[PDB]
UniProtKB/Swiss-Prot annotation:
The chain holds residues 139 to 455 of 482 of the full protein. It is an enzyme of class 3 (hydrolase). Insensitive to all selective PDE inhibitors. It comes from Homo sapiens. One of its GO terms (cellular component) is cytosol. This is High affinity 3',5'-cyclic-AMP phosphodiesterase 7A. It catalyses: 3',5'-cyclic AMP + H2O = AMP + H(+). The gene is PDE7A.
Length: 317
């Protein structure tokens, strides 16, 4: 019954107003698997790459179950949301007319696995508490490298692409890594500045693989922080969840005298100001540049929502 209602929702998987929260409830927590499998079929990837559907479901389940459902924000639903957004971006004219099945395959896998096995705390926390991951990745994009190598592990274990040449599997791992690493927010200035420069010069050639993947990396960055670009009813829920996670880290830091990280103090930092600052300094700059690249109704709709939602938070003051 609810399963049948889930199928109908997927008919509008391309809508910016898709409700991932409802979709996950109807599928009993199977949103990432159900949505991603559907997108693989929709984009013809199963046929294009001669995929074994049994291995595909196993791979997707491995990913989904390796997310910590106990995290209020960084869980499989966030991953499914990012994947759904990435799908909407792949439908944008400039990408739709240039991406290959291989690019779509990598983009969706990257989106689905970009926060894999996230512990619910940030890089600075891992570094100051001497977590083994901080040592392993030399305090550099610690979380993102962890998500990437975790994804590589699942790719190899599932054998989903065992029929393709070794070189292809190795390239897949590298390109997915480039996509996942671009989601390290601490490096947004580097990616945004580069994207902005290319747009200023107007020299982006989408038939060039390197230029196209820079665009895909920017698309995934957009997908990762597009919560404020969704309609208020969805955006509001995302804001409460991410703040809940931040404040929980802050509670740990306070309890163990670790020093409270920025945006994590529930006693001195307002959820309203956290959201407003995030929208003003990180979201709007990125989506404004994205709008220059893809000057469509979707880009204007997303910017419109940030403006409204931003105003709503200021109003709640
Ligand atoms: C820290 C990182 C998850 C980026 N980030 C953030 O800083 N704020 C404030 C958000 O609301 C938010 N929502 C998604 N990502 C977010
Ligand atoms: Mg991340
Ligand atoms: Zn994310």
């Amino acid at each position: 019954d609810y399963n049948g209602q889930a199928k109908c929702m997927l008919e509008k998987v391309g809508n910016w107003n898709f409700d991932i929260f409802l979709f996950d409830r109807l599928t009993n927590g199977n949103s990432l698997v159900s949505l991603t499998f559907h997108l693989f079929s929709l984009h013809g990837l199963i046929e294009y790459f001669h995929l074994d559907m049994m291995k595909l479901r196993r791979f997707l389940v491995m990913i989904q179950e390796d997310y910590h459902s106990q995290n209020p924000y960084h869980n499989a639903v966030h991953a499914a949301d990012v994947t759904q957004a990435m799908h909407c971006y792949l439908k944008e004219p400039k990408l739709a007319n240039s991406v290959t099945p291989w690019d779509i395959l990598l983009s969706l896998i990257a989106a689905a696995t970009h926060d894999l096995d996230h512990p619910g705390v940030n890089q600075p926390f891992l570094i100051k508490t001497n977590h083994y991951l901080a040592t392993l990745y030399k305090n550099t994009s610690v979380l993102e490298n962890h998500h990437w190598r975790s994804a590589v592990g699942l790719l190899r274990e599932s054998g989903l692409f065992s029929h393709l040449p070794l070189e292809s599997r190795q390239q897949m791992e590298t390109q997915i890594g480039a996509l996942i690493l671009a989601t390290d927010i601490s490096r947004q200035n580097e990616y945004l500045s580069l994207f902005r420069s290319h747009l200023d010069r107007g020299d982006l050639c989408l038939e060039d693989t390197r230029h196209r993947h820079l665009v895909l990396q920017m698309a995934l960055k957009c997908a990762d922080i597009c919560n404020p670009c969704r309609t208020w009813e969805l955006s509001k829920q995302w804001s409460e969840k991410v703040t809940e996670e931040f404040f929980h880290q802050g509670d740990i830091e306070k309890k163990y005298h670790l020093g409270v990280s920025p945006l994590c103090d529930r006693h001195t930092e307002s959820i309203a100001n956290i959201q407003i600052g995030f929208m003003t300094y990180l979201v709007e700059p990125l989506f404004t540049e994205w709008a220059r690249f893809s000057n469509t109704r979707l880009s204007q709709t997303m910017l419109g929502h940030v403006g409204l939602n931003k105003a709503s938070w200021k109003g709640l003051q």
